[PDB]
Design a protein around this ligand. Structure first.
Ligand code: MG
Ligand code: MG
Ligand code: MG
Ligand code: MG
Ligand code: MG
Ligand code: MG
Ligand code: MG
Ligand code: MG
Ligand code: MG
Lengths: 520, 37, 72, 128, 304, 195, 132, 133, 101
RNA sequence: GGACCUGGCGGUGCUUCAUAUCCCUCUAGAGGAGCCUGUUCUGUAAUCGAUAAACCCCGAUCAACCUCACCACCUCUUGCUCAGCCUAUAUACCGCCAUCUUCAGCAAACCCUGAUGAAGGCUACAAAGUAAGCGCAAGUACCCACGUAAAGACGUUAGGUCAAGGUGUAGCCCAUGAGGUGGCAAGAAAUGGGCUACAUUUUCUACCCCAGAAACGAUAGCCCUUAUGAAUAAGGGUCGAAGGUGGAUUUAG
């Protein structure tokens, strides 16, 4: 969906989101222009007539109560229905058809809040003829758009006089209630409805949180589901996996569910429940807590559509790469360097600590360069982390050139942004390792950089060590005009200068030695 | 039909997306003509 | 080149054989001559279908039945 | 018609009449010159009569971490925008046509007491 | 200058990628394979090779330019730098030194190729005088190093065959020896099979010439090959023809008969026929008619 | 302000699945393509322009996709789908014996949104009367009826059908015409007997 | 003296592209065609319609991506599929670029009842063939 | 490393009726570029080889259509300018080819056409005699 | 928004001849037929004469689409010679070169 | 007014040349008669433009009705046009071409000479010129490497074209815009380009080349048929002349 050139190449999750949202907004603008000026695109130049390409017609026809009623279910709104009820009740006083009244009630309950109150209190004027369909759709509406006492009253009225109707009724009853839940389940199973288990899914959704006294009975309820043999175990299974949430991991149940989802993966899947999108995200959320790599590989035909939203995809990939990092890591970095362009701070931090524990120093540069190429700019948390981890090292002598290069790039990025004020406190935190790496070939750069640092300070023990190594690595005056100044500045450089002045520094001139004596 | 074409392009200029250079030119010269009489 | 536009399941004989649509005149007159030539040309024409051909012959029926004055 | 319409530079050439009969021979004209003007650079892409609110190009796409929606710029709003654009075009035209004051030397319309400033730097580097 | 090495290494990497995508090992690989791959993966209707897509090695793409002729500071390296034509003049100096050394002891190379062998322009006059110096060198005896210096510049003569192709004899049923040839013309194309053992009658498209050509100059042209060689009634021939013009088909059949008989007859008589000039396709064709002209060459009447 | 990341040249390795990175027809995309292939007439001691600005590679048709490896892969994939020709039918005499009635149609395809074009309707068919007529009177009658639809040098009777716009209309009309023609050549007339 | 799709030789102050530089009689010898369709070939038809619609498309896209392009376009019509290729500059934001891409795509598709798609290649500054 | 486990394949059903037998499929490509035509020919012949079917090749002649236009605008009859379109043909015959093979191959080739080319199929199928005859 | 009033008239004539095409064809056949009565031929001729103006397909002209130039237009491309030369030189359309034969 | 620089010009000198161009030369033609089609001119209510070279079967690879832009008559006034105008200005222009060009030079940027003036810069056994780039050229197209096409810059002719189209300026904006009926588009005449023949190498007949007869010439006119169209073209009968190979000059190869 994204373009190929590098400039248009979306190099971050938020900007990519905004980009394809702008594309969708252009699609909506196209819809608006076509449905505002249909006559322009009315020409059917293409030989195969396609209603997908034909302009769209939400235009009410002339006043015609019967055809207007038939067009009600075509226009998909509520003002037309109000006007039609008005025309049929006030002056006509007749019903075009009970099916038409049922469809009107369907639409009005779907559309639903004082407006919902008015829409629900304006349906009782409907002609006496109100069958089950009408009553149970009123229940549907009062449940999924308003409070639950009204739905309960309507259900009692119906009893005095469907699968997802009773589903909504159970939702209303539930949303501690032990006897309620029990009698509900009992009479529901007693009736001959034979639900599609969406009632069970909804009662699970309501049981999202409870102790073992309903977490464990869910297992036998699922075993009964399996015995009747209806459920694919797509959503209720995942919801009980989530309900397992937790002061202590349950390794036994974890292994059991591992085998279960293993055979579920082995078999082929077909979608039936609209809530299979939270499946992916919360499943990987539980996987992250579990921390297992064979588990991650198991969780990894066209079942990749259930990821959907970029937020859930982000959570999944983040937890996946985090587990893979915190698991050698050669195969992990292989998988990563394979999926980085397709895939999208915390992940990079985990990568840095994984590379540290691995000791693969040569890899971190390329990773930092990739992050910078994509979106890593105007933030120094990861810069601090990489600098500390890379200059805790000095063991590669030839790699000091790469140290200097990446340090120069890091400083080029660090000094970009004055107006923001955020670049002022970055050197105070991470300039020490940067300057040490610069010292480790080129030295004048690090010299003047430490000058700028101290002339911005927060001295440090490794800063003292840096100053000492720099001074000892031939030029007395060039070393003095730095070490003596930093000593006059602060006391630890002075207690180090006490020793520095022995070799060849104090013999040059006494005015700076006099200043040192005064400060000491 | 130039009808459809020109009507589409005029409406889209009024929307303000197609910077019609010839139309800009004509408009500026009409403005100058009505300014100078 | 014909995915769609199947001509309403029309048939070659419905196109070509117009004797079923020729009923209201004998088989000797000049009206017969003209209508036979019409059916010939229509069968030769693939561009138009049985509907168009019956519309043609119906307009011809209307024409000469409104000009039945002569019959010479 | 739109098919008859075409690019801008052609129109500018045809209007300026830079060459072909009058520019040559030095005959020129009676000190009348049409000044080149760039119109596409001036206005933003979103400007038009119907002032729909465009999160894509005319409005920032995101606000308060919330996606935006197409909206309407009503009568007095688009009138304010048109007045602002008129004022901006008038300002640009004023800045375009102005006086030019080269210091009077020996006499007006004479290059006697005029100074070109110091020479240019040399190729190898020589500042004068 | 580093751009050169950049392009070289990038071209090597692209060559490896090309071998991978085409699907052969990159160990063995050639530039004819390069050009075939480029022609297949990116065809082009462009007629000029310089315009067509070409994946070439950078050493051959970029024309060699002289590097810095003087050090970072101070003097230059070559000892003619303060004048132009330094290489040319140093070479001429060495040449004159060799000339005077040989004196005290006692094909050609094109101007553009010379300029591209060097990196300096020059003039026709100094080119001529250099050629004159070479000729003066070669007028006298010269040693092995001198001959090598001369042949460094001298090129191959590249002489053409100047020979008439001999078609192979053929054998069919009856043990019939024969030879087939083909001729063409303005708009006529024919093929004739000559049978040596047979002789006498001749057929044309299955019809004898006596009645196929009512005119006699066509038969005279058909006889001209045999008459020149003098073998008249000792060879028979058949021939098929497809053409518009009578004289056109006549000349085509003549050329085909000659191209078939040159095989049987000895090389001496083949040379004699070539000298006669009847063994070359007629390049003359009706010129194109022009839009402004009444014909191929004629202008409209000058109206003044 | 913003800068465009460097191309995928340095990123792509020597070992790479080109059929995967170029599945379908697509333009050159030099940023993704690593090859330095240039094309364009050079200036005197010049060179063709670099691939980044070389829009002539885009002008020309594109064949970076569908490499030989990709072709081999897709053929190996579709081998299980494609079927086999009968081994018994391995010669023209044998196939025309098994199924004498030859029939052939045709149609063009051109770039554009529309697809209909009247030449789709035309069809032709052929049959040799050497083995199908099985009689002499009806054969003479048929060859007298048909004017130019035959050819005795090759000995095949050929007939075309274009009277109907639909291909199947043409087909079944030709079939019915041949049937009625045979049935009417079977019989005879008194004026036909008198010759 | 012929003046037809060619540049007047200036002092050396005129950056010219490959196409704008080369002559029209060099079109088949050292250039390609901006469009690629079969209406021109023998037996086909609707060539006038192809040319009119592609000219209108070029104008509309030039004016709905104004100031960003620096060269003529490349049209590639494979059967039903329509492919566009453009070279542009990094003047405006990728937000605007993608928004206008989707906008033009939807408009062209709904107008021509044809599957349309386009590609755009970024350049920092327009490539120049010579300075005439 | 990301290599799929089980490649999902489309469903295929062998209808009880017999498949049609194409005697000869003669395809004709009309193009503007001989190089593009040669590339397309190599593509098609390699596909047919790897599928295991017969093939022959030959290059029909080049056809041209040219026409003269007025070079100038108002008054110039002798000064004209010419133009010409060159169409190049390439024909390919496939023999003894099953109906399903024909369908799959033509679908593949038609999806893998280039742009500036037109493609003309002549299908030749045999059949036995009808039942009324 | 046609280019000009003569283009407007041309398009009007085109649409009139179209919407009276089949009628004119039928009555013209009834006129030009020979064996039918001459009085009927005269009837149909008077009918054609009474038919409205701008309905015959001969009054239309194959004018240009871009510049509205009637003369110097190709029936195939429908474009004037000048605009065709312009597009061919600029390389807008596909598969035309200069005839350097 | 004296003296100079550049260019043009010389019925200006010397030399080398003239490819079909100067001639001498070779061939076939134009100014003879008729016809077709343009131009000038006459009259009409009845377009317009180029109208020497470098237009005259030119805008036009089309005008019986639209094409129609002329004219008489009759109507519309926001008029398909967020109007329109074939109204003037090609001496505002773009766009597109003729011209020398069947040439080969044009030249940013530097230096030098002339007392540092306009201006010039060539001597090869070489004396101040160096040259980006364009063009020529090369390569490309057709059958080759030749040939033919293509290409052929800077600039002159204020060259042609606001009538391919657009546009600057000036005007009509009940009109100088728009719409529908009709005719206009002939020749007392002069001129131009092409076709026909004025002969016997001709004319007719079957074939296109071994034959037999005569001793020609209408693509004009009258009548008729047919082609499409709602309403000029091809064919047939008759008429069977002018015409006898061109009055200076001139074209093309
Ligand atoms: Mg003054
Ligand atoms: Mg010319
Ligand atoms: Mg007219
Ligand atoms: Mg007017
Ligand atoms: Mg002028
Ligand atoms: Mg040349
Ligand atoms: Mg030429
Ligand atoms: Mg003039
Ligand atoms: Mg007529």
């Amino acid at each position: 969906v994204f373009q190929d050139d590098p400039y248009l190449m979306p190099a971050s999750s938020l900007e990519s989101r905004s980009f394809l949202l702008a594309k969708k907004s252009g699609e909506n603008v196209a819809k608006f222009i076509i449905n505002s000026y249909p006559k322009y695109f009315q020409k059917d130049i293409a030989e195969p007539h396609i209603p997908c390409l034909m302009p769209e017609y939400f235009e009410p026809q002339i006043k015609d109560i019967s055809e207007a009623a038939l067009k009600e279910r075509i226009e998909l709104r509520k003002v037309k229905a109000s006007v039609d009820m008005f025309d049929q009740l006030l002056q006509a006083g007749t019903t075009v058809s009970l099916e038409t009244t049922n469809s009107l009630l369907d639409l009005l309950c779907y559309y639903g809040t004082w407006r919902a109150k008015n829409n629900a209190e304006r349906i009782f004027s409907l002609m006496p003829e109100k069958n089950e369909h009408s009553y149970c759709t009123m229940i549907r509406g009062m449940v999924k758009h308003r409070a639950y006492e009204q739905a309960l009253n309507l259900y009692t009225e119906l009893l005095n006089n469907d699968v997802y109707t009773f589903n909504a009724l159970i939702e209303a009853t539930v949303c501690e209630k032990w006897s309620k839940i029990l009698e509900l389940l009992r009479h529901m199973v007693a009736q001959k409805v034979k639900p599609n288990l969406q009632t069970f899914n909804t009662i699970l959704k309501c049981l999202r949180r409870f102790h073992v006294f309903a977490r464990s009975p869910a297992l036998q309820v699922l075993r009964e589901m399996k015995a009747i043999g209806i459920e694919p175990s797509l959503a209720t299974y995942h919801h009980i996996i989530r309900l397992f949430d937790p002061g202590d991991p349950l390794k036994r149940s974890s292994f059991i569910i591992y085998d279960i989802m293993n055979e579920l993966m082995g078999k082929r899947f077909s979608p039936k429940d609209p809530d299979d999108d939270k499946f992916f995200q919360s499943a990987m959320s539980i996987c992250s807590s579990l921390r297992d790599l064979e588990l991650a590989y198991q969780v990894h035909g066209d079942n990749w559509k259930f990821i959907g939203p970029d937020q859930h995809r982000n959570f999944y990939y983040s937890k996946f790469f985090d587990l893979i990092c915190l698991m050698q890591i050669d195969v992990t970095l292989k998988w990563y360097e394979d999926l980085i362009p397709s895939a999208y701070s915390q992940t990079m931090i985990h990568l840095l600590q994984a590379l540290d524990v691995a000791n693969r120093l040569e890899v971190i540069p390329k990773i930092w360069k990739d992050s910078k190429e994509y979106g890593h700019t105007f933030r120094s948390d990861l810069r601090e982390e990489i600098l500390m981890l890379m200059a805790r090292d000095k063991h590669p002598p030839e790699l000091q050139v790469a140290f200097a290069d990446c340090a120069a790039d890091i400083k080029s990025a660090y000094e970009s942004q004055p107006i923001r004020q955020t670049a002022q406190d970055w050197p105070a935190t991470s300039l020490n390792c940067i300057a040490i790496l610069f010292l480790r070939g080129r030295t004048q750069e690090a010299w003047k950089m430490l000058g700028l640092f101290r002339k911005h300070k927060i001295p440090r023990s490794e800063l003292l060590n840096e100053l000492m190594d720099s001074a000892k690595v031939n030029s007395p005056s060039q070393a003095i005009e730095v070490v003596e100044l930093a000593s006059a500045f602060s006391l630890p450089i002075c207690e180090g200068l006490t020793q520095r002045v022995m070799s060849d520094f104090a013999i040059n001139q006494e005015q700076k030695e006099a200043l040192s004596n005064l400060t000491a | 039909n130039h009808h459809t074409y020109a009507e589409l392009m005029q409406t889209l200029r009024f929307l303000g997306l197609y910077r019609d250079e010839h139309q800009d030119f004509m408009d500026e010269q009409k403005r100058l003509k009505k300014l100078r009489g | 080149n014909e995915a769609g536009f199947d001509d309403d399941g029309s048939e070659f004989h419905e196109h070509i054989f117009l004797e079923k649509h020729l009923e209201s005149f004998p088989k000797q007159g000049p009206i017969r001559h003209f209508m036979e030539l019409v059916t010939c040309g229509l069968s030769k024409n693939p561009y138009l279908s049985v509907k168009q051909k019956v519309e043609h012959i119906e307009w011809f029926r209307n024409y000469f039945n409104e000009k039945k004055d002569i019959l010479k | 018609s739109f098919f008859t319409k075409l690019t801008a530079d052609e129109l500018w050439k045809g209007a300026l009449a830079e060459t072909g009969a009058g520019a040559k021979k030095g005959r020129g004209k009676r000190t009348k010159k049409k000044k080149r003007k760039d119109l596409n650079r001036g206005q933003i892409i979103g400007e038009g009569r119907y002032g729909f609110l465009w999160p894509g190009l005319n409005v920032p796409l995101m606000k308060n971490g919330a996606v935006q929606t197409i909206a309407q710029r009503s009568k007095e709003e688009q009138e304010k925008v048109e007045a602002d654009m008129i004022q901006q075009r008038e300002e640009w035209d004023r800045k375009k046509k102005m006086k030019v004051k080269r210091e009077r030397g020996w006499s007006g319309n004479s290059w006697g007491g005029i100074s070109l400033g110091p020479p240019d730097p040399g190729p190898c580097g020589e500042t004068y | 200058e580093d751009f050169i090495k950049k392009q070289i290494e990038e071209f090597n990497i692209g060559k490896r990628h090309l071998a991978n995508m085409m699907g052969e090992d990159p160990e063995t690989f050639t530039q004819e394979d390069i050009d075939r791959a480029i022609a297949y993966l990116f065809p082009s209707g462009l007629f000029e090779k310089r315009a067509r897509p070409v994946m070439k090695h950078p050493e051959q793409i970029f024309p060699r330019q002289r590097a810095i002729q003087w050090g970072e500071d101070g003097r230059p390296f070559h000892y003619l730098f303060y004048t132009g034509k330094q290489s040319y003049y140093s070479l001429m100096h060495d040449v004159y030194g060799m000339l005077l050394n040989l004196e005290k002891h006692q094909r050609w190379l094109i101007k553009e190729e010379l300029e591209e062998m060097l990196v300096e322009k020059l003039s026709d006059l100094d080119y001529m005088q250099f050629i004159r110096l070479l000729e003066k060198l070669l007028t006298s005896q010269c040693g092995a190093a001198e001959e090598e210096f001369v042949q460094r510049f001298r090129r191959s003569v590249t002489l053409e065959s100047k020979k008439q192709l001999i078609e192979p004899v053929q054998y069919d049923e009856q043990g019939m020896a024969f030879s087939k040839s083909e001729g063409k013309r303005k708009t006529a194309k024919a093929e004739a099979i000559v049978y040596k053992h047979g002789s006498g009658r001749i057929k044309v498209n299955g019809i004898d010439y006596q009645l196929y050509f009512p005119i006699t100059q066509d038969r005279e042209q058909l006889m001209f090959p045999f008459h020149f060689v003098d073998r008249l009634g000792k060879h028979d021939v058949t021939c098929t023809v497809s053409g518009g013009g009578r004289s056109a088909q006549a000349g085509a059949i003549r050329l085909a008969m000659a191209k078939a008989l040159c095989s049987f007859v000895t090389e001496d008589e083949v040379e004699w026929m070539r000298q006669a000039g009847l063994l070359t396709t007629d390049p003359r064709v009706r010129e194109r008619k022009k839009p402004g002209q009444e014909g191929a060459r004629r202008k409209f009447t000058w109206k003044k | 302000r913003r800068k465009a990341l460097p191309p995928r040249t340095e990123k792509m390795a020597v070992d790479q699945d080109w059929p995967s990175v170029y599945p379908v027809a697509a333009p050159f995309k030099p940023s993704a393509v690593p090859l330095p292939v240039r094309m364009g007439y050079p200036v005197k001691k010049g060179v063709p322009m670099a691939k980044e600005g070389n829009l002539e590679l885009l002008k020309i048709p594109n064949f970076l996709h569908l490499t030989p490896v990709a072709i081999k892969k897709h053929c190996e994939a579709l081998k299980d789908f494609c079927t086999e020709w009968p081994a018994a039918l391995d010669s023209d005499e044998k196939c025309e014996k098994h199924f004498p009635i030859e029939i052939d149609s045709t149609d063009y395809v051109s770039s554009g949104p529309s697809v209909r074009n009247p030449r789709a309707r035309v069809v032709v068919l052929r049959v040799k009367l050497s083995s199908l007529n099985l009689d002499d009177h009806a054969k003479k009658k048929l060859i007298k009826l048909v004017g130019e639809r035959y050819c005795k040098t090759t000995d095949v009777l050929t007939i075309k059908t274009d009277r109907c716009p639909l291909r199947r209309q043409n087909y079944d009309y030709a079939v019915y015409l041949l049937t009625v023609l045979y049935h009417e050549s079977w019989n005879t007339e008194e004026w036909e007997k008198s010759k | 003296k012929n003046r037809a799709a060619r540049v007047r030789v200036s002092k050396g102050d005129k950056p010219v592209t490959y196409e704008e530089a080369h002559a029209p009689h060099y079109i088949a010898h050292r250039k390609g065609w901006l469009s690629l369709h079969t209406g021109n070939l023998d037996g086909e038809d609707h060539a006038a319609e192809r040319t009119v619609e592609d000219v209108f498309l070029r104008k509309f896209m030039w004016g709905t991506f104004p100031g960003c392009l620096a060269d003529q376009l490349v049209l590639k019509r494979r059967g039903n599929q329509l492919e566009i290729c453009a070279v542009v500059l990094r003047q405006l934001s990728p937000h605007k670029y993608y928004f206008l891409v989707g906008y033009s795509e939807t408009l062209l598709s709904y107008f021509y009842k044809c599957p349309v798609r386009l590609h755009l290649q970024t350049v920092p500054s327009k490539v120049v063939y010579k300075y005439l | 490393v990301d290599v799929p486990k089980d490649l999902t394949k489309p469903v295929v059903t062998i209808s009880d009726e017999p498949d049609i037998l194409y005697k000869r499929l003669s395809v004709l490509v009309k193009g503007h570029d001989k190089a593009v035509l040669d590339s397309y020919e190599y593509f098609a012949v390699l596909a047919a080889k790897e599928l295991g079917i017969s093939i022959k090749v030959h290059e029909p002649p080049r056809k041209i259509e040219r026409f003269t236009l007025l070079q100038s605008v108002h008054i110039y009859k002798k000064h004209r300018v010419q133009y010409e379109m060159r169409t190049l043909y390439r024909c390919l015959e496939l023999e003894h080819l099953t109906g399903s093979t024909a369908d799959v191959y033509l679908e593949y080739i038609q999806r893998n056409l280039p742009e500036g080319v037109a493609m003309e199929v002549t299908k030749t199928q045999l059949e036995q005699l009808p039942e009324h005859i | 928004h046609y280019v000009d009033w003569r283009m407007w008239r041309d398009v009007k004539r085109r649409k009139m001849a179209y919407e009276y095409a089949d009628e004119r064809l039928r009555i013209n056949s009834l006129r030009k037929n020979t064996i039918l009565p001459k009085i009927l031929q005269d009837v149909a001729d008077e009918e054609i004469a009474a038919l409205p103006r701008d309905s015959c397909p001969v009054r239309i002209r194959n004018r240009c689409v871009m510049t509205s130039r009637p003369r110097g237009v190709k029936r195939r491309w429908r474009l004037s010679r000048i605009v065709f030369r312009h597009l061919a030189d600029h390389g807008q359309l596909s598969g035309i070169q200069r005839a350097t034969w």
